[PDB]
Amino acid sequence: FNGAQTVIQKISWLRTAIAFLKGYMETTGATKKELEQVEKLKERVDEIATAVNWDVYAQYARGDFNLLSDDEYKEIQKALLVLEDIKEQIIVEMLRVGLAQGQMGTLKISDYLDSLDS
Amino acid sequence: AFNGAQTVIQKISWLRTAIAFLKGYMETTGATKKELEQVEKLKERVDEIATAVNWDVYAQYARGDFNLLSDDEYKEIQKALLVLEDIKEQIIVEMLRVGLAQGQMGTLKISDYLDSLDS
């Protein structure tokens, strides 16, 4: 797998998803608790994001080859996992706040978010 | 000369990845508190402009994924794009200052690598 691209795409999706939620909340006037929960999620993203910055440089440094150590690979995989839990909590938050009411889950929102990243 | 939310996200993401790339290099080579603080001024600039342009992520969606903007909205975005392009050149300057690149050939190879991570 391409380690750096993978983590970057996941962080970018999650940041764009937070921007989306923030905007929906401003336009609809969400509860104080709702804006707190979103803020808590953004902080969880910034924390995990820094844990992987090493790979953004590391990958470039070793001739753009994806030749990582066992320990490095595992830490990237564990970060990828935390990021996927964040995605889950984002979608759950979207649904809880009234986003995607008359929509088949968050399918359209998700497709729109994916479009912004590629 | 933009296309809405996609342009802004792609610009903010490149800037955020370049900062990640700078913090990444500094960890390996070792950095001072002063060396780290100038990277942090850049990160704070990206976070400032990002929050002023975030409304457009939900707004473009709320109108059939069409970049359809009001007068205030369009002017506000024209401003934000100018600041973002300034931060981009500041980061390039930073790449040379910290010794990550020597000349225009090095800054291009790093940007090409950052584009590749984002696209």
Numbering used by the authors:
A (entry chain A): 2 to 119
B (entry chain B): 1 to 119
Paper text:
Pyrococcus abyssi virus 1 (PAV1) was the first virus particle infecting a hyperthermophilic Euryarchaeota (Pyrococcus abyssi strain GE23) that has been isolated and characterized. The 18 kb dsDNA genome of PAV1 contains 25 predicted genes, most of them of unknown function. We present here the X-ray crystal structure of a putative ORFan protein PAV1-137, to our knowledge the first for a euryarchaeal viral protein. The fold of PAV1-137 is a four-α-helical bundle analogous to those found in some eukaryotic adhesion proteins such as focal adhesion kinase, suggesting that PAV1-137 is involved in protein-protein interactions.
We purified the C-terminal His-tagged protein from a genetic construct deleted for the 14 first residues because sequence analysis predicted an unstructured conformation for this N-terminal region. Two copies of PAV1-137 are present in the asymmetric unit and their structures are almost identical (root mean square deviation = 0.5 Å). PAV1-137 contains four amphipathic helices that are organized as a helical bundle. The dimer interface involves helices 1, 2, and 4.
